[PDB]
Each structure stands twice: as structure tokens, then as C-alpha cells.
Design a protein around this ligand. Sequence first.
Ligand SMILES: C/C=C/C(=O)SCCNC(=O)CCNC(=O)[C@@H](O)C(C)(C)COP(=O)(O)OP(=O)(O)OC[C@H]1O[C@@H](n2cnc3c(N)ncnc32)[C@H](O)[C@@H]1OP(=O)(O)O
Ligand SMILES: CCCCCCCCCCCC(=O)SCCNC(=O)CCNC(=O)[C@H](O)C(C)(C)COP(=O)(O)O
Lengths: 312, 83, 193, 84, 157, 228, 253, 85
Amino acid sequence: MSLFKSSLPAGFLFPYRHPKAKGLVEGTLYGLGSLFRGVGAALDELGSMVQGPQGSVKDHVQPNLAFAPVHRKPDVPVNAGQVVPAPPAAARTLKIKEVVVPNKHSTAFVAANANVLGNVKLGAGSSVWYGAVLRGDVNGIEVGANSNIQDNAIVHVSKYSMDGTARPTVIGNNVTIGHAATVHACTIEDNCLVGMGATVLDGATVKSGSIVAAGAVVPPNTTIPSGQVWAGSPAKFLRHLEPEEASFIGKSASCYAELSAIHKFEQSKTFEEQYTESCIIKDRAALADPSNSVHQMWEYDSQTALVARAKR
Amino acid sequence: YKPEVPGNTVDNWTELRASWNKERASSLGTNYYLNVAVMGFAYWLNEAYYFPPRTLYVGALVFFALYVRKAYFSTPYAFKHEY
Amino acid sequence: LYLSTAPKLSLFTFWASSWHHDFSVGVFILFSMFIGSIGAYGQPALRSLFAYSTINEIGLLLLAVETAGFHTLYQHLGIYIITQLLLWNLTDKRLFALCAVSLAGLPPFAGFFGKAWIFWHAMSVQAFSLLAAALFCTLLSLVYYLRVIRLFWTAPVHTAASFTGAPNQTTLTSACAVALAFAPVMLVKPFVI
Amino acid sequence: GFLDKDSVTERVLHVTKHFEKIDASKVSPAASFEKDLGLDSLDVVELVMALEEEFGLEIPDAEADKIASVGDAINYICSNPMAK
Amino acid sequence: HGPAQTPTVFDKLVEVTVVDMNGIRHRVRGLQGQSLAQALVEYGFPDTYFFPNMGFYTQHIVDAHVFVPKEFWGKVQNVDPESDDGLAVKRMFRDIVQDYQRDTSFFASYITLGAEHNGMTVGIGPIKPWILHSEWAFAGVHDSRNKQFDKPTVEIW
Amino acid sequence: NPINGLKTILHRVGFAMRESGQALERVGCRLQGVYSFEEKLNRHATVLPMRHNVPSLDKTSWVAPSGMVSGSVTLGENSSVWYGAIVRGDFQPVVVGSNSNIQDAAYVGATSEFSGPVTIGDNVSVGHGAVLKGCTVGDNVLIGMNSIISEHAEIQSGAVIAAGSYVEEGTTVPSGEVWAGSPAKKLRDVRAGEAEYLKSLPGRYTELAGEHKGIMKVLKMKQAEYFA
Amino acid sequence: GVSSQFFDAPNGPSVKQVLIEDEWYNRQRSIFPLLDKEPYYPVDVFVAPNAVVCGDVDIYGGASVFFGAVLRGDLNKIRLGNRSAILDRAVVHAARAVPTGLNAATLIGEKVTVEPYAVLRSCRVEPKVIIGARSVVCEGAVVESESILAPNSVVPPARRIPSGELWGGSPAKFIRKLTDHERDRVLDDVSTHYHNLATMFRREALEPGTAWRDVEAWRQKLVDQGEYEWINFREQKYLMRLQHEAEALEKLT
Amino acid sequence: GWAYSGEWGMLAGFCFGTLKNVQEGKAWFRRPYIHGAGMIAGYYLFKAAADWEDEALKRIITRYERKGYAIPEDRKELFAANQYK
Ligand SMILES: C/C=C/C(=O)SCCNC(=O)CCNC(=O)[C@@H](O)C(C)(C)COP(=O)(O)OP(=O)(O)OC[C@H]1O[C@@H](n2cnc3c(N)ncnc32)[C@H](O)[C@@H]1OP(=O)(O)O
Ligand SMILES: CCCCCCCCCCCC(=O)SCCNC(=O)CCNC(=O)[C@H](O)C(C)(C)COP(=O)(O)O
């Protein structure tokens, strides 16, 4: 119900894909288009043949690795992910009966180019950001509620170690994992912060309300007690927590909840919505001219660039 | 090495400020008066094209020597309260 | 862009077709050339630079009118109009230097040929004083066209992409008009007469 | 420092002089409105309005509320870039 | 070289109090070696406060009309009034300021922030309407929320 | 090299034919009224040739779909490039031996102007997030996580680089020694129980790469069900 | 909790929201806006296909964003200078405020190269600077012009690296002074080398390529089966705004 | 007119396509169909200019002879000629 809801042509309403052709002219144009598509793809393939061995590499869409399975192992218990039945094609081809996919809460945000695989649990309101690697393949990965794993951070677990201990990675609630941080087979308690570019190694414990500083390397089997800040390579004691930094940790968690909302809103739009929005952006820039001849008769809706009402 | 700016900063900046504390006139008066001068009196030069060249060259040099430049122009009469 | 091309062509064609006067325009030639050159030397805003350089060019066209020989007038006007079509549709600022070297009359580009037939026909009928003034103002014009080259050629290149479609929408016309470096082969011949 | 610290001071004394509830000889270049001169808030507002009338300014409620002394008023006028 | 202090940003910080044309005082932080017009732009002041430096080869520099107290008059950089830079300042005073000029009037790009400016109070002066081209002008009224900092380029053309 | 001249001419001619064909196909799509070509999907390539330089991958090697290899890259037998890892040989070539693993989101490359080629030996573990620029790595070496190995550095056979270390440019690390630190320095010798885990490390990665390659095949068949 | 619907988005509310686990192919854009914050970039930029540039980001001249790098301008602004290189999987972020009180935007000057896996957040990097690999430059810090940071170095918040020097370590200390030829030529050489590599990548890119043919084949199969849904997105956005306004009006009174 | 005007027009078309690529940030060989269309247009434009050369010479000799300027037959071949110089 803008003003012309029953008179707009179908090409204007559906810019991503026009409906079926009816008349002679439109069908002739459609046939010419199919001929052009055939000849163009043929010339593309012939050019790839003339080009050489580099032409054998083709353009293919990539799999969705944000929600990806791993092998169900008999020695590995599944405590973070969920065991789902295998697809029938996989079963009849290469002998798969059960795979392990992650347990993802409905309010969590995962980046479209992140890699979250297998035995991983993602809590409510939590977030995994662009380029992050969460590979739960030989043990479990747990991420608590309102926790963020930031850009290009690596999370991994161990089944076989130097000292023969299988260790999962558990991340508590309201935890911020910094940019390009390395989290490997260790425990992060509630309301902690790991600095950007820092490394926490196997079997180290970060107790609640502590901060690992930027660039720090936490050696294996090290316990960082509550209300302390550690820094350096290898990390030693630096300071006690300030009164303000403890509230800063919660501020950081709330800020990434608010940010993950906006990023999930932008990411989860379909192709048809994105193409309609590009056509709307084009119409809005055409309407930004104050000398546009429609400005003296029609008033346009700001968010959709449709005619809302007659101006005069 | 860089050369030193000559003078004092306060005195130089007062020299830079001088005679510009005034609202600038619109250009319509200058343009209209130029068009009136050309459309009314440029026919006085019709016979001048046949005059001897020494006269024309000395007249051109005289016009160049008595020309006053429009940019950065100022009069003392702009800031006095009586003639 | 509209004001610097079409009405000058229309009015000069009326002048070529149906106008005779028993007078001269020499003082307006002197005024246009000296005022345009000195004004474009002295004005730091680029719009005023191009306005005063336009006054200088119309003084050259008036020198072509005054000595008769409308063939040089038409050649210089055509080259100027093509340069104007390049000037006001530029998005890459490196081609602003080509307009500069072709409006300064530098030799291999087409502006040289447009100025040089005007100079040749003026010397043919012995219009010595107006020609000397034109040569002095041509020597002055080079300084601010070099200022243009300093501003837009010896600088890092930045050209913003389009976001709301219409991607660099007049690259066809500007790239076509930059090929005024290939027109000089036809300009040297007896072409415009 | 936008204006001098003498002429503003005597102008402040000149407008402080014509107040009926003030003493024309007790006024000092560095005094207080409350302990020394004995003024409540409305008298302070009236004096600040007189100073605003003399120097041609506009002093907001918080800035005039911070002014509690002759020296404070002189320093506020001197620090003001729009003084006359 | 020994146990001397690590360099901090706080060692190079300069604080200037700026009073805008509505009388509202603002705290403006800058760094040593940065001009005043740059610190004013990065603080977030509106684009109607700024205008091109009207010299040749420097119109990409933004500049503002500031009122400077008498104590800091000698810390503005010196300009020869006979040089071309002097004629640039004369053009700016002739065309942009006009009859808003006072004895404290300067231009903010000619103030290079150092330790001697620490605690200096300046005020923004008013300017007349002006135009450089169609994409950079000022109609005369400071009614716009657009910051100068948010402009991606300063365009001479 | 005139062979490269003929390859250059053929690659440029084939590229021009490909551009012309794709443009004509887009004109055909516009005539049909279908605008699927305008979709801003991810155009990431797991294998990225640089003109006529194609990566040489063994049939038993595996590159994860979020990983990438570019230019002149050689992967040996049962060698793995994991998730998010970037191995770049478009400037100078990269040579990886057999049974060596480049773990998740690791950077191995030779892109500096004066860098030599990267040579990684046999049974090499390159940890998570390690950056390798123009180095040579011998056989049976663990590169620790988030470590940096600089140009012309020589990591000889049997040495261990600890996590977060930085080996300087042109630094030779001897055999059977553990080095650590950001100005990296010798800490101790490799112990025997340590060396047992060092020997047993790359085979696990080989079998893990096999399992992950099978799962990625399942994902590709699931994807192929949609359009075929 | 925060809702994932925005009725005051510039192009309106999202009609159809797709869960990430229901995606059968990767749809990650490399350049995209966040509500009203649109990235700005030149015609000759190189953005790698697996790099992410989002939000309020300004890119100038001959700058390049290499493979897997992130430039996220969601809390503040980020500016990348002329011929500045962001190498493989480096992260540039920005905070809302800094302890120094200055502008919190991350400003990167011209001819600045940032080596792999380095992180810049709310810092100021002046022209002609080499940031080493695995290095972190924290909030409010300043790196001055013609200076070099060694790999695996930490610059703590509100700290300064003086001009003309090489610094390195955790925390960063003085190493040595750069030579005059290093300041004159070598920094520009590194930036120019990485720009040349980016140009080599830019020449060979076929955009948009042909990966859309499979997705279009699937959509054609859906139109064949009669299961392709045609959605009037403009009208649905309009009707959703009208319903939102009615729901807001029917609760205040 | 000039014999090599079409080849000059083709070089003009190639330079046109290269400049249209350089303005939009593309390498010189990109979009070769733009080069081909530019080459065709440049060829026909410069051939038309070479035809106008002969046309202008013919107009000059015709007008000059009608006004009374009698040109000898050794010099009339400099004008009334489709010379492919
Ligand atoms: C994108 C999301 C961002 C977030 O929300 S948090 C994730 C990223 N945040 C971070 O950068 C966390 C790390 N930040 C900090 O520096 C902090 O937490 C760090 C708190 C311990 C300390 O940062 P401060 O700005 O508080 O610095 P201090 O006053 O504590 O510094 C004391 C001391 O420790 C040293 N120090 C300080 N910071 C560091 C570091 N980082 N590394 C090594 N050494 C350090 C430093 O040398 C100092 O000594 P001198 O300089 O010799 O006098
Ligand atoms: C055109 C003319 C029209 C005028 C009409 C407007 C007239 C409005 C008058 C009515 C408004 C009132 O009285 S308002 C009522 C004012 N009285 C109170 O509030 C009770 C508490 N006493 C005070 O506040 C005293 O002012 C004091 C003790 C001095 C506090 O000392 P300071 O001051 O230091 O603070």
C-alpha cells in the first residue's frame, strides 16, 4: 500500500529475476539470451583450453564451514557438539553412519567465513568473528554465554599430548578473546579477558576476573589466580586488577553482544534482498537531485524509494 | 638550513590585517559601470587606429603607467569620518 | 561546459555568414589577451583560472577574425571545443595535464596547431603589433598551465570508485577526446579550408 | 588575556559602585560576594547582569553560578573571547 | 642511554580550550607538531567552521578563523607580508573575514602546537559567505551537523 | 626464457577469449532477465594460479577449502594445508616435502623483495598461526605456535622452536636443540621422551587429514545435490 | 539481549533472515556496509576475496588488503593511506574512546606496510612505517613517521615510538637508529613492492567470474519445480514499517 | 588522402582502449572488445578524414577556377586527384 501497489510492473517489483515471458517480443529476447549464454560459455571454455593448465582450475562456490561436521570417534566422547545421523549419500558412498555437528544457540552469531567444526558448543548471545578457527575434532570446545572469539583467533584442543593427557578447551561466561589470540587446550573461567595477540598453551587455567595482556605467552600448566594481570613471554605477574577494569570486562562483553546483533542483521540477508537494496540505493541517489522532475508531484518513501503520496 | 622570516610576527600580522576590516561590495556596480563605459564611449577610438604608431605606443605605455590595480586596492577615504 | 562551447560556435558562424563592419576590434584583442593572461596568472582558484584563460583564448579567436582568414578561426575553435569537452568531464586528474599541455600550445599536441595557423595568417597579412602582443601573452600563459601540471600530475593518484552504480560514467568521452594527440596528422594538411 | 587587567577592573568597580545595598568604599579589587560584601544569590545574579550590561556579553546560569568573587568576574571577562 | 622514561603520548599532549561561536567552552587535545586547524578538525567541529587556505598549491589545507590572546601573539608563525604567503593571508582576510576582523584575529593553520600553547584559550571567529567551487561553499549560517572530519577528501576541483 | 614467452602469449590470448565469453554470457543473462551474476558471493579460491604458474599438488595431499596455495607451490606425499592457512608462492616458490603439516591459519610464504624460496622438509609440523617468511626448514622439526621464522634462516633437522618465538634473519638453528624467545636463543637440547612425541606427531596429522578430506568430500556431494 | 531486527536501517527492516546453519554455500561479502556506515575505496584497490572490509572505512589511492585481513569499522573510523599495504590476516580495529582523550579512529598514513598477523586498534601510524609480524599496537598509541617496529613486538596503550628509529620487544624498547638511506628509500621500496604484488593479483582477477552458474542452475531447477518464491521486498519493507508504527502507537495511549 | 590513415586510426583505437582501462583502474589488456570497437571506429574516422582531404582540394580548385584563376594543367593534378600519398 504505497500508492501504486496494484500498477507496478513485475520487473520493478522483482529486479533479481523477471517472471515468465508472454508475448512474441519477450520470447524472442529470451531465446536470443539463451543463445548468447551458450556461445559465451563456449568461448570461455575454449579460452581456458587455449590458455593452458591454469584454465583447468574453475570457479566454484565454497562450502559453509561455519557449521561443519567432523568424524564421530569411538574413543572421543561427544559432550559439546551433537551426534546427528549421516546423509544417505555419504553412507552409501564412503561409509559414514554418524557425524558430529556443533550445538549452536539461536541467539549466537557466527561469521560466514569462520570455521566452526564438530564438537563445539556455542552459548546464548555468544559470537565467533571473521576468520576465526574453532576446530573441535579430537576433543570438545565449549564457549559460554555472552562470550566473543574475535577476528583471526585460533581455538584448538588436544587428545594426545607430550604428557599423555587429553584436554578440552572450556571458555566461561562473559569472556572476551582478543584479536589473533591463540587458545589451545586450556580453561578460561567466567568474566576474564585474553589480550589481543596473546597465547594460552596446554592445560593452563585463567581464574575468574583476571586479564592476560596483549602479546603474552602463558606457559603450559600455569594457573593465573583471580584479580591479577599477567604479561610477557613467558607471562609473569604484573599487577592486580583495577576497580575499573573489572567493569570494563563486562562492558566489553556487552559491547560485543550489541555488535554481533548488527553484524548478524547485515550477514543474514538473502541475495534477493541485497539486490533489491542495491536497486533502492540507486533510486535514492537518483532522488537526491533537487531538480528531479518527480519532486514537484510525488513524495517518496525514504527507506524503499516508493511513491508514498501525492505532494500536491 | 632555512632562511629566517624578516620582521616581527605581531607587526607582520598587523600589516596583513590592514585595510580589510570592511564589508566587500558586490561586483554588480563594477560590471555595470564597465559595460556603460564601453557601450557609451568606446566609439571615441575609431579614428585612433589610423594615428601614427609612435603616438599609439606612447599612449599604451601611458595607460600602463597610470593603471591602478584592482586586487589589493585600498583608499584612506574608507576609514575617515570627514573629507 | 555548455557555456564555453555551443554559443561561441553559433555566434562565430553568424559572423562568418552574414556580417560586415567598417571598423576594428584591435583594442578588445589587446584587452582580452593581456587581461586574461595576467588574471589567470594571478587568481589561485581554478574556476577563475579557467575563466581568465578563456578570455585569452577568445582574444586569439578575435585576432583570427580581425585579420580575416576564418579557416584558422574554425580550426582553433574546434580544438578548443574538444579540449573543453575533456576538461569538464574529467574524473582521473592525470588527464588534467594533457589539457594543460594542449592549452599552452606545446608543439606535438593539437592546441599548438590551432594557435600556430592563427599566428601564420596574422604574419601573412602583416598584423605585427597584435601578433607581438599575442606572442607575449602566449609566453605568459605557459606559467599557469605549468601550475596546473604541478597541481595534478606531480601528485599521488586517488580516484574514488562509484557506489550507487553508474561506474565512472563518462570515461568513453574523456578517453576519446584525449586522442587529440592523433588529430595533428590531419591538421598539418590543407584540411580546414 | 583577550583584554587588559586594569580597565576591566575599574569598570567592574564602576558598576559595583551604583548598588544601594553595597558600600561604595568597602569594595576591593579582590573580595567575596558572600562573606565580605554580604549578598545572597539574587543580588549576585543582579550584579552579574549589571556586568553583562556593561561588557556586552551573555553569561549562562552555570557560569554565573560559579562566579563568587570580584576576581572571578574579572578573570571570566578576561578569559572571554567575545568581550567588548 | 639508560633507565630513562619510555615515550608516552601524554608527554606530547597539548590541551587548548576552544570557545565556539555559541559561547560553549570545549576541551581540545592535540599533539606537538600538529597544527591547530587539524586538532580542531579531529575534535569534531562542524564543516561550516573551516575554509580553504587561499594560496597557490595549498588549497587542500583547511583553515579556521581564531581569536588568540595577547600572551600567545608571539607564538603564531611569522609571515612576510611581501611574499606570496603574505598575499595568501591578505586574500583570506580580504574575502573570508571582512568586518569580523579584530586585533586578535589569526588563522589556525599558522599555529603549530607546542608546549608553549599548553593551556592557551582561543575562540572561533565568524566568517562571511564564500565559495571555492560547486562542491565546497558556505551559505553563511552555521546550521549543519556534518563534521569536517567525516569528509573523505578535500577537493580543489 | 622463450618457453615462458610462448606460455605468456598463450595465457594472454586465452584470458582475452575468457573475458569476451564471460561478457557475452552476462549480456545473455540480461536479455533473459536473470541477474544471478550480480551476486556478491565469496570468490575465494583454494588453488590460485599466477598466470602460467600452477600449484603442483600430489594426489594424496590435501588443502582445506578455507586454506589456499598460490603460484609455484609444491606439496609432497600425504602433506596437509589446514583451515585458513595461506601458503604463498606467487613471487618466489614454495617447496613442501612429504608428511608435513601446515596447521590452521598459518602463513608460509616468500613475498619479500630479497627473499629466497621457502623449502620445508619431510615430517614437518608448522603450528597454529606461525609466520614463515622465506626460510628453510629441515626434516623432523616442530615449528611452535605463533612463531616467526625470518628470511634466510636455517632450521636444521631435529630442532624445536617453542611457541611465540622469533628467529631473526639469517639465523642458523643447530640440530637437536630447543630455541625460545623473541630474540630467540638456545634453551636446551631435545630430550628423548620429547623426541618420541616429535616422531609420532606427523602421522596423526596424516590420518586427521584423511578424515577431514573425507568429510569435505561429503560436503561437496551435499553441495552438488542442489544444482545437479 | 539485543534484537537482530533494525527498523531504522537506511534500507529498511530485513524481510527474510536466514540462519547460518541453513546455508549450503559461502556467502561472505568482502566489502559491505553496517547500517549507515559504508566503506570508501578507490578504483584501483586490491581487496582479497577472503578479506573483510566492513563499516566506516576510508581507503585511498593504491592501498591493498591481502588474504584473510580484517578491517572492521563498527565502533569508530579507520583510514588507510595512499599505497599502504595490509598483509595476510592482519586485523585493524578501533575503540570508541582512548585514554589520551584524542580521536579514537585508527589513522594509517601513506606508504605504511603492516606485516602478517599484526593487530592495530585505535592507534596512530604516521607515514612510512613498517610494522613487523605478530606485533600489537594498542589503544591510543602513536607510531611516528619513518620508524620501524620489529616483529613480535608489543606497544602498550598510550605509548610512543619516536621518529627515525627501530624499536622492538615486549614492551618495545630502543634498538637502533635508521640510516638516512633507510628513511629516504627503503620504506617506500617496501610499500612499492607490495603494491606491485597487489597489481599482479589485480590484473588476473576475473570479476564476477563464473561461480554463480551453479547457484543459478539450482534456482532454475526451483523455478522448474514451482518452488521458487517471488517476494516483493520493497512492499514488504513498507508494510513492516507501517505495522511497526501502528504497534508503537497502540501502546503509549 | 594519406595512405596510412587507417593504420593510424587503429593505433588511435588501441590507445583509446588502453586509456579507458587506465582511467578505471584496470590493466592495459583488460576488456579487449573495447579495444576492438575503438579500433573499428578509429579506422573509419581517419578514413573519412582522408576522404575530406581530397574533397577540400577539389573544392579549392573548383572555386578558384570559377573566379578566373586559370591554373596550368601541370598544376591541376596537384588538386583534382584522389592521390593516395
Ligand atoms: C578488540 C577488542 C579489544 C578488547 O576489548 S580487549 C582485547 C585487546 N586488549 C588489549 O590490548 C589487552 C592488552 N592491553 C594492555 O596492554 C593492558 O591490558 C596491559 C593492562 C596489561 C597494561 O596496559 P596499560 O596501558 O595499563 O599499561 P600499564 O600502565 O599497566 O603498564 C605497566 C607496565 O607493563 C608493561 N605493559 C603494559 N601493557 C603491556 C602489554 N600489552 N604487553 C606487555 N607489556 C605491557 C609496560 O612496559 C609498563 O611498564 P613501562 O612501560 O616499562 O613503564
Ligand atoms: C513584569 C514583572 C512580573 C514579575 C512576576 C514574577 C514574580 C515572581 C515572584 C514569585 C516567585 C518567588 O517568590 S519563589 C519563592 C522564593 N522563596 C523560597 O523559595 C523559600 C526559601 N527562601 C529563598 O529561597 C530565599 O530566596 C533566600 C532565603 C534568600 C535563599 O537565599 P539565596 O537566594 O542566596 O539562595
